Amino acid sequence: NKIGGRRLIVVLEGASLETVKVGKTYELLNCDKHKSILLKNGRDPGEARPDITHQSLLMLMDSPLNRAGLLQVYIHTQKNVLIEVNPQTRIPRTFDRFCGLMVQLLHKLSVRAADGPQKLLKVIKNPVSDHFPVGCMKVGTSFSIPVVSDVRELVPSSDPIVFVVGAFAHGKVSVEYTEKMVSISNYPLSAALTCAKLTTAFEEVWGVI
Amino acid sequence: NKIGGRRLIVVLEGASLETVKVGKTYELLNCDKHKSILLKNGRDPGEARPDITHQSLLMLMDSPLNRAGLLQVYIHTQKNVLIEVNPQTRIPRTFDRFCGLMVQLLHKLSVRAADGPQKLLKVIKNPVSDHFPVGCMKVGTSFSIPVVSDVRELVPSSDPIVFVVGAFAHGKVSVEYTEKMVSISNYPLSAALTCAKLTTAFEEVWGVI
Numbered sequence: 538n539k540i541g542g543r544r545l546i547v548v549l550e551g552a553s554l555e556t557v558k559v560g561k562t563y564e565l566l567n568c569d570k571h572k573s574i575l576l577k578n579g580r581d582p583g584e585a586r587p588d589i590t591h592q593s594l595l596m597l598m599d600s601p602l603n604r605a606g607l608l609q610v611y612i613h614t615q616k617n618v619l620i621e622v623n624p625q626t627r628i629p630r631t632f633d634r635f636c637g638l639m640v641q642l643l644h645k646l647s648v649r650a651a652d653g654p655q656k657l658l659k660v661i662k663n664p665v666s667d668h669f670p671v672g673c674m675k676v677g678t679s680f681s682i683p684v685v686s687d688v689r690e691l692v693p694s695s696d697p698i699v700f701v702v703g704a705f706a707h708g709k710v711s712v713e714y715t716e717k718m719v720s721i722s723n724y725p726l727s728a729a730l731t732c733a734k735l736t737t738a739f740e741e742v743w744g745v746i
Numbered sequence: 747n748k749i750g751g752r753r754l755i756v757v758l759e760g761a762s763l764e765t766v767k768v769g770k771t772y773e774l775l776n777c778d779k780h781k782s783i784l785l786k787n788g789r790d791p792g793e794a795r796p797d798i799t800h801q802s803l804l805m806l807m808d809s810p811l812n813r814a815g816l817l818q819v820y821i822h823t824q825k826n827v828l829i830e831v832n833p834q835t836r837i838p839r840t841f842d843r844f845c846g847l848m849v850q851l852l853h854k855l856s857v858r859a860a861d862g863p864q865k866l867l868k869v870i871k872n873p874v875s876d877h878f879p880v881g882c883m884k885v886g887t888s889f890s891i892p893v894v895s896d897v898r899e900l901v902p903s904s905d906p907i908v909f910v911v912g913a914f915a916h917g918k919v920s921v922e923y924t925e926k927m928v929s930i931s932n933y934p935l936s937a938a939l940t941c942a943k944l945t946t947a948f949e950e951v952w953g954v955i
């Protein structure tokens with residue numbers, strides 16, 4: 538079995554996705570609309586950047602890696618909500634539509650296809666590490682790592698592997714389950730470009746062209 | 747001169763960027779807001795997808811290639827407006843803010859930095875080919891090309907080169923100045939992922955890590 542159970546698992550860690558009530562209407566928290574409200578636990582609405590997750594998901598789900606069936610995505614929010622993304626999910630290109638979809642997800646706990654019974658988005662049980670397959674390395678990503686890795690040299694020939702990419706406005710990926718941390722550039726990148734780069738490198742090594 | 751005048755020039759061709767008047771307010775045309783208005787020349791407001799240009803510009807301007815000084819970007823709109831992007835321009839991550847910026851650009855014909863006299867966006871004279879440097883190959887991109895090219899094999903060692911990427915909702919890059927057309931994948935990609943892939947390939951060949 539030279540294919541084995543190979544696939545890339547990306548966790549978007551610290552994603553800024555959460556709902557707030559304004560008047561009678563529920564909206565996705567957003568630092569352009571909601572700087573003047575107050576949050577539980579002293580959290581800062583000025584850091585609410587759901588656009589980072591939107592743009593990262595667009596790159597991940599568009600990727601040839603995804604449409605070849607070699608990608609799985611999870612989202613782990615700053616409120617400790619774990620979301621599984623069905624590989625069939627088309628993320629809306631429109632930011633406002635994306636936000637409405639996330640409000641529905643966080644309220645109902647899943648979103649089903651309108652043309653079938655299949656859940657395309659689902660809130661699942663923490664920790665995300667319980668959902669990884671056996672024989673799987675776990676790698677976190679950070680600009681702060683002083684040596685830069687070539688991503689193609691990190692791709693296993695026949696194993697599944699997890700990469701954790703931060704989806705916060707500011708911070709550093711720091712989770713219990715990673716076995717190492719890598720930098721992939723001497724420049725600080727967007728999460729979305731990081732995702733495009735990871736998928737591109739895996740596509741090359743696994744022969745998705 | 748082993749560096750020469752090398753750099754990557756990307757033209758976003760057929761970008762959906764134009765202003766409409768609704769009431770007393772000018773807005774960027776958008777197929778979610780404006781399907782019920784009428785346009786000059788029988789054009790279809792349902793095809794107005796400025797998000798494609800927004801997301802492509804985010805990938806281009808974030809790229810290590812751009813911050814190493816090896817990228818130039820032009821935008822050529824469906825209304826035949828040619829826009830030069832200063833390499834220093836930070837494209838807003840917020841779609842609504844991006845749209846307001848484009849309205850200002852299309853009205854005033856430039857946008858200056860707020861902290862200096864430098865124009866960061868400017869409407870310039872067609873044709874875009876008059877603005878390319880000497881010794882420059884011109885390549886268009888399309889999924890319809892039956893043979894797929896490895897992008898790294900297209901990167902010249904020491905010359906400038908132009909890549910034309912469609913920024914329309916639907917269509918095919920078809921311009922007078924390209925010398926060849928290439929596919930870079932067996933999958934139809936987003937413009938934005940195409941841009942991430944081009945910049946990534948050029949970064950590798952030109953040693954931007």
Ligand SMILES: Nc1ncnc2c1ncn2[C@@H]1O[C@H](CSCC[C@H](N)C(=O)O)[C@@H](O)[C@H]1O
Pocket residue numbers: 589678679680701702703704705706707708709710719720721722723724725726727728729731
């Ligand atoms: N040079 C680098 N090496 C490895 N990972 C990087 C990187 N630059 C960025 N990243 C990844 O991308 C994230 C960027 S920081 C968080 C996202 C960012 N605020 C945004 O607007 O997109 C990091 O958490 C890290 O996971």
Ligand SMILES: Nc1ncnc2c1ncn2[C@@H]1O[C@H](CSCC[C@H](N)C(=O)O)[C@@H](O)[C@H]1O
Pocket residue numbers: 798887888889910911912913914915916917918919928929930931932933934935936937938940
């Ligand atoms: N396999 C492929 N090979 C080469 N270029 C491709 C490609 N897939 C997409 N492109 C480029 O990306 C554009 C996608 S079509 C226009 C953009 C698209 N509607 C979007 O939503 O982003 C094409 O015009 C072409 O320039």
